[PDB]
Design a binder for these strands. Structure first.
Ligand code: MG
Ligand code: MG
Ligand code: MG
Ligand code: MG
Ligand code: MG
Ligand code: MG
Ligand code: MG
Ligand code: MG
Ligand code: MG
Ligand code: MG
Ligand code: MG
Ligand code: MG
Ligand code: MG
Ligand code: MG
Ligand code: MG
Ligand code: MG
Ligand code: MG
Lengths: 220, 106, 104, 252, 62, 53
RNA sequence: AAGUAACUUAAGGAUAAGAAAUCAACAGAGAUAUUAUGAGUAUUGGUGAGAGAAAAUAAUAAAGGUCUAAUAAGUAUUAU
RNA sequence: AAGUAAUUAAUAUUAGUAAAACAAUAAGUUAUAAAUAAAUAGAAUAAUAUAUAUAUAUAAAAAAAUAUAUAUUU
RNA sequence: AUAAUAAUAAUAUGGUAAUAGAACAUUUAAUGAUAAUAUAUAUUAGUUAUUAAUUAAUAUAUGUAUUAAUUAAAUAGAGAA
């Protein structure tokens, strides 16, 4: 005979749903688990209705603000990169840098990279890779570990569109026959960050034109 | 590259019912990314830790016995082999030890 | 060559049909009655002396220009000098940074 | 000294015989991988696939009228007190015999459940493996592959009957007769059959139509787990089987 | 679909598998009291387990 | 195996063919499965009632 | 609750909308409609009850652009 | 003649896959790091906390709190 | 190192509100032998620790169980309005 008339679920998968209002010996008899006679017995009071006392969403003062200007980077630890390298998944030709796009391709970072990647230092001891990295930013300790390894980090600015283009340049080419140009940092805070040598920002490390233009304006 | 290879290149030992894989022998296949299928699992609301071992081909009982022999420090009781899906559950977070034991062959 | 031309996107092809490249259209605003009147610029009507809105509204013009850039057919389109829009690499290069960027 | 003594490498290829259609004649072996055609028969996975498919299939046309749907007036039939009878509102109440249903469903009732794609693929493989084990998986081909024994003169390598549409002498036609002869030969007249084609074999389905109640001709893309398992003997094209294997292979 | 209680979201913020909140009784009438004693009320506070379930129900996407 | 099938009149399943590595094994299989059913038609395997005795 | 029920009026096989005085952010897109994600996010509330976008990416979709206007004044804008 | 359905959220059990999962058109959701109102900050300088990370504070420690580290990442 | 059944020793087995676990009847969908010597329904008397089903007799229908079993589900069980 066909298997189709002899298939069961795996043991522990299914259950019988508790069926109310269906006789006394059932257990869930006349009252059907409701108790006896109150508002909850025949009607609806809200779960978090605290009775009339000042509730736990009212006693306490409202705290903080939502920074809409915030753009949370996805964190990538050096440890994970090292592990990838050990596994022989970190496929890089000599000279080619491990950029955010490259990380995504490899599966170092996974899921949607909306705003960027920060490189943190959770396995800085056993990190020994002389490859060059490039991300939104890195932790100071992580940077130091990279330097020790014989590597080279560069914090690179990416607007959300610019980041997207970096991650998936072929899509833009398919759609429009042209990948979009990478934007300059318009914001003051961003400019300041990438102008820091301590952060290994690209504007100082590559000696950018924007920074020079700003200096000229300041002079004049 | 080809899903079904040609009749010439396939050896006799590669076929089913050859080399006696069913009788008292086993295999433990690695994951897609290429790691040992041994996992911590935090059941009953983080209260019950257990170590699960997946992707076992062939005789699971024999494999379990071999692992017990390798790791005498874990008790005999705490080795629940669920037969429907063929995976062997251990009580503690004994993942790393299991991996160490398996690596040399699988 | 003809087949390659035909293979061009629709909007661009339509533009070429109705404003062909044999006519050297003006860089500056002109009379609306003129033959060389640029469809991207606002041309003045000679009787009423009112600036007519561009024959190709600004979005459409921009799309046409981007299509031309894609297929390398820019110079056959009439000039977009006195329309304030720049595009892509030329825009990037020629622009001055904002006062806020240079002088916070 | 020896850590895992009984460790070993599993077998990876099962031979399926490639046949000519009208008469199921062995032309070649073809080694299909063990994962497709000889997986361990996990019933639970198979069950999951079947139930999900059944749920997807659901029409869900149950449409009993609730007290709103039901078409009485909203008027109070008897005044609250001073009637000498029980309290009543409008005539639509579930309590009364002509009134609408309590907790009434309303079509279209969506019964669609979800399954992970990998689980579904595994189930598909598993069903196929079970069929192979039973001896109910007839792979027909020989066009692409290199043969051992040559194809017969009156058979053909694809899954189809010749000159089915031709019908000159009598109302009876040849493809139907051939099919009947085939059924008679392999002792599967009343048995359920499942012809998994690659491309649309119009002549085959015409031949089948007499035995439409038991014979189900399906494409490579539209074939189901249910269809495979219900079948008493599946007749799959080699190319179609390859395609299915490719579809439901575990990715690496 | 379900939605967050906005007042509760304003009052409470996530901290791993709990919620943190501000202290009550430090907005006026602070003069006269001891400053050291008052310093107890300046910081934050983790949710009491009694109302944890309520908080979860209020904030389904936290 | 094809020759054996042709002479026999019966079909040896694909899985069986894959499994059995010798002519002797094939013969043994035949003796086990097909032969008794051929001898006695009431003893034969029925599809609708697979767990028959 | 809700611009809902209702009443009233007027049209067509559909109507409505529609080729940016639109979005966006120094990079760019490049019409309107419907759905999915974005997102119960920003936003807002006797800051209670509760209400809640857009950009962007996907589908569905059709050839989707095209002049018919001598380029628009009691109009934009302002106060209320 | 009475605990039903839809859209959601949180738990549990099993099953699939697993440092990834779902989805494969891209995009997204969850996980992979803990914090903080928020900010350009973020886990052993030579090992278990006596080290480190964050918030308060600070020259830097200490101090409260939570988190991170003892062939193989969870 | 399991499951079923059976022994021995021990402890436990009243229960409203409530919580948890396990079954059965009914109806539909998927798979599905069989047959008037059969099946279904009813009555009566037996049987099985028994809301259930089964045996026999009797009656009426039907050339026949969407039947046993496993799953999926429910307008799934009424002395209480
Ligand atoms: Mg009770
Ligand atoms: Mg009371
Ligand atoms: Mg009562
Ligand atoms: Mg009560
Ligand atoms: Mg279901
Ligand atoms: Mg005190
Ligand atoms: Mg309103
Ligand atoms: Mg219209
Ligand atoms: Mg509204
Ligand atoms: Mg105008
Ligand atoms: Mg105007
Ligand atoms: Mg006004
Ligand atoms: Mg400070
Ligand atoms: Mg009791
Ligand atoms: Mg009922
Ligand atoms: Mg009754
Ligand atoms: Mg009763």
């Amino acid at each position: 005979v066909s298997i189709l008339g002899q298939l069961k679920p795996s043991d522990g998968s299914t259950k019988s749903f508790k069926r109310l209002g269906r006789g006394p010996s059932s257990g869930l008899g006349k009252t059907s688990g409701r108790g006896q006679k109150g508002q909850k017995a025949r009607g609806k009071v809200k779960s978090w209705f605290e009775g009339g006392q000042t509730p736990i969403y009212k006693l306490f003062p409202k705290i903080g603000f939502t920074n809409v200007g915030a753009k949370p980077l996805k964190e990538l630890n050096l440890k994970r990169i090292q592990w990838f390298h050990d596994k022989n998944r970190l496929h890089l030709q000599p000279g080619e840098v491990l950029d955010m796009n490259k990380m995504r391709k490899l599966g170092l970072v996974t899921g949607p990279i909306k705003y960027g990647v920060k490189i943190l230092a959770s396995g800085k001891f056993h990190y020994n890779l002389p490859i060059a990295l490039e991300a939104s930013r890195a932790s100071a300790k992580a940077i130091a570990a990279i330097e020790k390894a014989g590597g080279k980090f560069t914090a690179r600015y990416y607007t959300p569109l610019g980041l997207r283009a970096h991650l998936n340049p072929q899509w833009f080419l398919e759609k429009r026959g042209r990948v979009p140009l990478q934007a300059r940092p318009t914001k003051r805070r961003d400019i300041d960050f990438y102008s820091k040598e301590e952060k290994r920002g690209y504007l100082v490390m590559e000696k950018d034109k924007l920074l020079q233009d700003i200096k000229e304006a300041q002079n004049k | 590259a080809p899903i079904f290879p040609k009749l010439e290149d396939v050896k006799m030992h590669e076929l089913i019912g050859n080399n006696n894989f069913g009788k008292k022998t086993y295999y433990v296949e690695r994951s897609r990314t290429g790691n040992l299928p041994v996992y911590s699992a935090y059941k009953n609301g983080g209260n019950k830790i257990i170590t699960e071992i997946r992707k076992i081909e062939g005789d699971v009982i024999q494999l379990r016995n071999d692992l017990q022999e390798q790791l005498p420090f874990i008790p005999k009781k705490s080795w629940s082999v669920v037969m429907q899906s063929k995976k062997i559950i251990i009580k503690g977070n004994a993942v790393e030890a299991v991996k160490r034991v398996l690596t040399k062959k699988f | 060559y003809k087949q390659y031309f035909d293979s061009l996107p629709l909007k661009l092809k339509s533009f070429f049909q109705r404003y062909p490249p044999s006519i050297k259209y003006s860089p500056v605003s002109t009379s609306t009655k003129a033959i060389n009147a640029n469809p991207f610029l606002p041309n003045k009507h000679p009787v009423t002396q009112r600036f007519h809105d561009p024959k190709y509204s600004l979005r459409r013009m921009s799309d046409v220009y981007k299509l031309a850039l894609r297929y390398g057919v820019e110079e056959f389109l009439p000039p977009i000098e006195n329309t304030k829009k720049l595009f892509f690499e030329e825009k990037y290069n020629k622009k001055t940074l904002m006062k806020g960027v240079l002088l916070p | 000294l020896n850590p895992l003594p009984n460790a070993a490498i599993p077998p990876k290829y099962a031979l399926v015989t490639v046949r000519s259609f009208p008469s199921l004649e062995p032309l070649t072996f073809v080694p299909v991988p063990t994962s497709t055609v000889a997986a361990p028969l996990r019933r639970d996975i198979l069950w999951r696939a079947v139930v999900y498919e059944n749920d997807n299939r659901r029409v869900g046309a149950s449409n009993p009228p609730g007290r709103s749907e039901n078409g009485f007036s909203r008027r109070k039939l008897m005044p609250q007190k001073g009637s000498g009878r029980a309290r009543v509102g409008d005539a639509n109440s579930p309590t009364r015999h002509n009134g609408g249903r309590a907790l009434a469903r309303t079509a279209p009732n969506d019964y669609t459940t979800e399954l992970p794609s990998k689980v579904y693929s595994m189930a598909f493989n598993n069903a196929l493996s079970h069929q192979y084990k039973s001896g109910k998986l007839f792979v027909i081909g020989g066009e692409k592959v290199d043969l051992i024994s040559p194809t017969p003169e009156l058979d053909l390598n694809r899954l189809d009957l010749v000159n089915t549409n031709t019908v000159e002498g009598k109302e009876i036609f040849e493809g139907e007769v051939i099919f009947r002869k085939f059924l008679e030969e392999f002792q599967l007249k009343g048995k359920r059959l499942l012809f998994i084609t690659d491309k649309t074999r119009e002549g085959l389905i015409k031949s089948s139509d007499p035995y439409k109640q038991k014979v189900d001709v399906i494409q490579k893309e539209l074939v189901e787990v249910n269809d495979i398992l219900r079948a008493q003997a599946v007749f799959i094209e080699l190319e179609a089987l390859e395609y299915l294997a490719m579809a439901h292979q575990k990715e690496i | 679909l379900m939605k967050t209680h906005k007042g509760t979201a304003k009052r409470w913020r996530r901290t791993g598998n709990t919620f943190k909140r501000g202290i009550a009784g430090r907005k006026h009438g602070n003069i006269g009291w001891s400053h050291r004693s008052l310093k107890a009320l300046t910081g934050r506070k983790i949710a009491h387990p009694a109302y944890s379930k309520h908080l979860k129900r209020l904030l389904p996407y936290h | 195996t094809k020759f054996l099938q042709s002479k026999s009149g019966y079909l040896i399943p694909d899985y069986e063919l894959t499994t059995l590595s010798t002519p002797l094994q094939f013969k043994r299989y035949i003796k086990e499965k097909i032969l008794p059913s051929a001898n006695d038609p009431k003893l034969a395997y029925k599809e609708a009632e697979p767990n028959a005795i």
